[PDB]
Amino acid sequence: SQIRQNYSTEVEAAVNRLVNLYLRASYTYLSLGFYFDRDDVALEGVCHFFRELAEEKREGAERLLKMQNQRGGRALFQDLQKPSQDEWGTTPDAMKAAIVLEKSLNQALLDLHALGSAQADPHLCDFLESHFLDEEVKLIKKMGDHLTNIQRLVGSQAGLGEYLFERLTL
Amino acid sequence: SQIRQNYSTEVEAAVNRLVNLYLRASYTYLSLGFYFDRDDVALEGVCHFFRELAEEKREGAERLLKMQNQRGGRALFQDLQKPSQDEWGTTPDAMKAAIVLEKSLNQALLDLHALGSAQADPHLCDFLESHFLDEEVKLIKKMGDHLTNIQRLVGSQAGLGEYLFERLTL
Amino acid sequence: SQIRQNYSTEVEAAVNRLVNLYLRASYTYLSLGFYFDRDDVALEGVCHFFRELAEEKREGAERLLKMQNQRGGRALFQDLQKPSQDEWGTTPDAMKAAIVLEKSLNQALLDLHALGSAQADPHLCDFLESHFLDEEVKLIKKMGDHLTNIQRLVGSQAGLGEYLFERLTL
């Protein structure tokens, strides 16, 4: 309360939820990464792609937690739900799941921004714009590009297509 | 449609128009630059000033086109109207025309921002602020400074004033 | 008129037309480049190839404009017609369109050279030979090579062929 200024309880709570969403996405990417590292899947390029995203999402959560404290809010942690799947199929299946996941994070950021706008919290709005919004847009475009390329390949010859993509793109 | 999210058809269309405006300004500056390179005009400093702006405006158009694709919109190109004049008069005449042109681009950016705000598109709003708005303000101030200096000189002795400005300022 | 010497009004006008043709080719390549940058097309190698040609054609137009002024002629700008297509199909379709475009520029250069010869303007003839003719021949050969390679690939397996070409040649 000593430093808190123009920071609504509604934004404070939403921020805590967003932290949980980012940590859950990070957990999800950790599962995806290790699945492609399995000897009966063995696509190193995909394993690395997803393991790098797990780190990025974790870093996003830490940035939000730092902001929470900077504004005088209080971080509250909740249980982290296990990933939705235990096995992730093939490369196209995995990339599709990732795009859906990212679109859900992006929507949560947009909703939080709308809330900040309604509450008249310009610091929050700038923070999201400067560290999250552009990052999400660029990432989603990249995934879209990948999906297109994977689909053009696995339409031709599945096994061969997955290998070429992992070797030449990732 | 695979990556498109929170990107209205109204903004998509406005973006395409803005691209056309930037390319037309670039074409205009190309004409201005080469006019001052004429043997019967011969003011190298002015030629370079305008040719550098032609490049800047072209780069602005390319940045908008990249953004269009990043958001999942589709670029549509239209004819580019020739510059409004074939001959540009003297330095003060040319600088006045340039300021008018820039103010028109600035207004188009402001209108697009207002549209993005009404549509609740925070990525668009940040993109304009971060890459266009400040750039325009700084450029317009510079042109204003130039105009003031050129006018103080050509009020004294026209031919002599134009030469001194080109030699000592540009 | 002070510096103008042995520079016919017929060549002066033809030069202005050629400038318009080069700027239109540049505009065309800009459209081609951004089309391959679309998330539902996504062939970075092709995007870069065409975007590099847009720059080359623009530079050709600027070289002609500089020459115009050096000879004492006057540059006159016209509207730039939008590219002939909004969507460019697949890699082979795009490369075919590009070859047709280049052959048309090459013919315009040849016609201008013939005009210069008829007018007895050796400076013009050398200028074209030294900066345009060899450049066009080398470029057209390269495109021919590409077409042959793309066709040998997409005859086998289309999607797979386009990906391999973009990854291994471009």
Next chain:
Amino acid sequence: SQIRQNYSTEVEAAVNRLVNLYLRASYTYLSLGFYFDRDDVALEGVCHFFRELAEEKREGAERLLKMQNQRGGRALFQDLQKPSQDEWGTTPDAMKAAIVLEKSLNQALLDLHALGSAQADPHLCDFLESHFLDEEVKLIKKMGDHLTNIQRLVGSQAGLGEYLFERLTL
């Protein structure tokens, strides 16, 4: 006669005349340069400009003489006529005289090229194009630029205009 091949006696003679024209232009520029070095004229920038041209024209004559021997022709030297004037007036007067002189050299080059074309001597034609034609065009444009600038200055205030041009342009 041992090495001579496809080298007409008409071109051989014309080459000898051209050598005389270049040496005479060099002599003319030497006079112009030293005139501006006079204590009662004293414009160092102009002195240097003309003295540099005297060297360039001399080098042009030596290049022609080397070519003459390379083709198996025989150099024949004639008297060199003194410059047309002993005193050169002011900067604008001198620059005007120089432009007239250059246009006369350029015409002689064009006439020689026409002769080479009629004689079907492609080596001569390339030699002129590669070492003289573009050089003349660029130089004449520069002089045109200077004249324009000098005239805009001396229209304002003569003495002051000549000084500024010499200080800021040359």
